[PDB]
Subunit: 443 residues, 3 copies
């Protein structure tokens, strides 16, 4: 779509818009299974088969030993605390109840894909992705018993190594992740397996299309939870994201310190909007993601997780156009630390240049085209390739889109430095006003 | 065991207890070795062997190039700063002293497991996990020399690929981890290798049992440090956790913001207990782990690292029953930021619901069964599957255990908002009282 | 070199010096390519080949599906915000322009290494690391067509698995990293490939030597960005670090809380220098890296990234010798939280011991050799192996180098606790003085 951006000189911040939401709001749990074999002079070929067979037995033993316990795993400090795999773990707990695994084993007898309702009413999609039981009970078992121990060909050795390797790698992953992995690898679930899983999922076509067109994101937002080995069934729960909010407007708020620029060192005061992060319209409110690194952007689609959000009044948006607006108390932090830096935005760069710092913007071939004066300023990515603040070189994002420079008096100029409350972190416009009023009162 | 939980309405916090400790207090260093070979018309089979031989030589060269340098690698801000592999690195430094590697090579001549005392008095367990010297000097060397270059069979090609692969993977791991890996993979140390290493370790039976029953945790708390290649010996130090504290009571403290709930926006004041995290009885004091994510829970056993702890007076526990107790100055932060969230506990959910936020608790099949009013409240996981605060859905942990709701007046009601010191982060009950006394004095 | 260290008793801090810089200041983008094949009764050998061929087709399809979108990915809070792969992504965008891939394909027709200037003037080094087109169009295609479907030998099966495996692993990596990986693995770029890439790079001999002697660090500071599949060319951009600052002095500042040690609990005040981290002389200024974990140390060489730095006046160094110096306003935080901890330095250990905490330093064989009294103190690593503060055991670094203990009155003694501004985080000597002056004024 049309990604656009606005820089507000008055508050040293910038909003990038035109993004479309894809928010993980829920979890879907599928049960992925591997059917196992329960099995007991040597030539070179049979020796290899027995070595591979040992790797198979060891992997099973290792996974069994692994499940002796229950499976487990600016404004960010305001977030709540969730339990990411509580739902997957609950489904896994149900799989341990007597008869439960047997239901699944029976379901997948004549097909590899099936929906099974568990005893607690939970309806899970089930998937047998590998039948090692059939392979070992055929092909291999006849050669290790009938002509003890050899009627063997090299192609069988190769084939067994190929088939067993998936089990070995899944086991490797679980072994260094304490039975819980994320992102979900293609060993857990191949691309085709995941795609057909998504297709057979109880979701809308919009969700199926969204997930199929972004499987690499789906993998990053999924968990594989090692669950149970019982009755020749190896089962792990794959916990998949449900995107219950799709195609709502999203915008990214970038902020940077705004300081006075007086000559005398240490006489300057600063203010920074702390409400930077991703914002998405969501159900009459606004979902706010303070750790913008928790969201992943694909073109103009932004994938976030509501577990890492606050739910805010939509008036929080007013802080962008009018930070002194009466409907929402815009959040800021204050300080006297006027250090220089830059924030690279979607479509340009914010530059907070203070003191003796050299701040410039350059083009690839031309070199320096703008030298920043002290204060907070901005340049768009059109005709600009890099920005330098001090010894730090920044490459700007080269995505196409228009920027708008909104001129306005830096609001830091509205404050008397003699009564300015610095070192306020979790503050706001009203809180700062409140403290200023008290300092003025005592004077 | 019996996991139980208590919610304190007065302070918007909850303690989960019944856990048993397993604290890493020390480090054990073992030396793991791979014995290497020092070696110099083609048919298809020999061509493959030579290709595999090149992968072997390259891996050795790569690891040699790698060791041109020395190996290196709310209240969390209060923690000290350690050097995690200082002990392993020190042992590795000793291995570089002349004659030192030769001692090990000699020790493992007729066995794969041996204890060796180093020249500095350190007694290390040593383990030859792979003898590539013997394999290459036999089997392979006779075919690349005698009938230059071919008396070869396909099973030898396969076998060499299998044996060499471990070396290639170990090399891969070290290459993207700058010679220091964690968790320790099954390439570094297979499950059987680790289990027998643990068995031969100079530790108590309780420790051996604990480590053997939790090898996946042991791996996560271990380091593999690439150390030396000298005299056909490849050696890496595996640094294993020593659990010097086992089976002491542990409890997890969950906290959430407690705010007044007045109608007028921005007129509310908040307070949050900052001492959330894991607590374990330890040697007459209490080990406090502020970053509860640094601990791993397996059923009712909790694995932590003392490097990520403070050592506190046991009176810190009093803050749970009486936050105004005279024996310990309970830590809190203050603010006016009354945003809504939930904290998912071991056995329920704390809900901090403020403003216009929709806060509910639901069952799987029934739907909404409780709607929270403004304030801090709690619900147990019995009959509850999810909690929703705003647009954020939380699944609760479904583990069995009893919760106790301890009623009490929210302590935030005891404060006059006109003299309440907000934006205090590293604060406490007494510090807040102290500041209130000064504001009252000037009035 | 000579690593030395000084401990300042007056401020509970220590500086380690003698380090040499290697700062990533820029980015170089190379284009790595894999040439692909565009291809359409069974015996065991051909069945395996067709299975491997399917893995090849699936990998291609998977990577194609992957690129349906644009590629994306105390005092730390003061840092700016960059876009790490903006330059690589920009080059990738250029590769999508018509004719652009064809230029590269033509360039690498008769050689595997070539420099190509793109249409936007960017000169990129290009590298064909694998020719699957040639392998499949030869060897394989003649057997799947001519004697449909079998004139096959087992060595061809093996060889194809070996050659195809790299493609499968690269695909695996991109699949769980959303097309952007770091560190750059040996699948993306083998050690030999990287070394010759570095050799053919447009950089000085000093840089080539530095990068070649530290390829494992180079990998950690590099990105592999999956870019395009078009006209039988698979291309990913590898974004390599440019070290524009080499061999300037670096030093590491360690700090720890300095508190009064009065008997009455809660009557103590504390101060901590917040400017801890790595410092490097750089272009007439000092590059300051607050998150010292963002730098990697190899012997006496320290690798940092300027994106994680502030650019400071060189007078910031004065805070080490004279924290009350008039030329730079040294940064500190204040509190009343007198908890005990230790900071392990390059050549010793800082111990902040308060309250009832047991604080000691030990040798390997002798045991406790020093018991710390309350206050901030230090011990060198000479003759010391461990330090214990409370229940936390610390191993000290055993690297060789001399320490100097600089005696001086703890500056916390210069403050009157009755007017001491605690809970100041982003503070400084002057700011604290300023607040003290106001509290004294109102009294
Ligand atoms: C890891 S850390 O940065 O050190 C956590 C520091 C938390 N902390 C706070 C709250 N706070 C933050 O969270 N950040 C930035 C990390 C986002 C701040 C920046 C500027 N002012 C206060 C900030 N106030 C404190 C007062 C005292 Br005394 C000791 C710690 C304090």
């Amino acid at each position: 779509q049309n990604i656009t951006e606005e820089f507000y000189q008055s508050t040293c911040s910038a909003v990038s818009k035109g993004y479309l939401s894809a928010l993980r709001t829920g979890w879907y749990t599928s049960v992925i299974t591997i059917e196992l074999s329960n099995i007991k002079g040597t030539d070179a070929k049979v020796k290899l088969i027995k070595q591979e067979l040992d790797k198979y037995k060891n992997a099973v033993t290792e996974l069994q030993l692994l499940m002796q316990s229950t499976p487990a795993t600016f404004l960010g400090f305001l977030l709540g605390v969730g339990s990411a795999i509580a739902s997957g773990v609950a489904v896994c707990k149900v799989l341990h109840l007597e008869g439960e695994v047997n239901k699944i084993k029976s379901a997948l007898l004549s097909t590899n894909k099936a929906v099974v309702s568990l005893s607690n009413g939970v309806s899970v999609l089930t998937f047998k992705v590998l039948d090692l039981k059939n392979y070992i009970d055929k092909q291999l078992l006849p050669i290790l018993n009938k002509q003890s121990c050899s009627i063997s060909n090299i192609e069988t050795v190769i084939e067994f190594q190929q088939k067993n390797n998936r089990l070995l790698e899944i086991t490797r992953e679980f072994s260094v992740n304490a039975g819980v992995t994320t992102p979900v690898s293609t060993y857990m679930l191949t691309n085709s397996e995941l795609l057909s899983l998504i297709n057979d999922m109880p979701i809308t076509n919009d969700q199926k299309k969204l997930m199929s067109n972004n499987v690499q994101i789906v993998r990053q937002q999924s968990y594989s939870i090692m669950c149970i080995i019982k009755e020749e069934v190896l089962a792990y729960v794959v916990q998949l994201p449900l995107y219950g909010v799709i195609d709502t407007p999203c915008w990214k708020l970038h902020t940077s310190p705004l300081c006075t620029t007086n000559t005398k060192e240490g006489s300057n005061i600063c203010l920074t909007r702390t409400d930077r992060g991703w914002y998405c319209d969501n159900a009459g409110s606004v979902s706010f993601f303070p750790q913008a690194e928790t969201c992943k952007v694909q073109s103009n689609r932004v994938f976030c997780d509501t577990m890492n959000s606050l739910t805010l009044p939509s008036e929080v948006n007013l802080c962008n156009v009018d930070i002194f607006n009466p409907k929402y108390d815009c959040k800021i932090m204050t300080s006297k630390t006027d250090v220089s830096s830059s924030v690279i935005t979607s479509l340009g760069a914010i530059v907070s240049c203070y003191g003796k710092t050299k701040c410039t913007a350059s083009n690839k071939n031309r070199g320096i085209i703008k030298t920043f004066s002290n204060g907070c300023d901005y340049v768009s990515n059109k005709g600009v390739d890099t920005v330098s603040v001090g010894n730090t070189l920044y490459y700007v994002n080269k995505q196409e889109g228009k920027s708008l420079y909104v001129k306005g008096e830096p609001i830091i100029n509205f404050y008397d430095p003699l009564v300015f409350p610095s070192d306020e972190f979790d503050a706001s416009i009203s809180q700062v006003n409140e403290k200023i009023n008290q300092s003025l009162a005592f004077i």
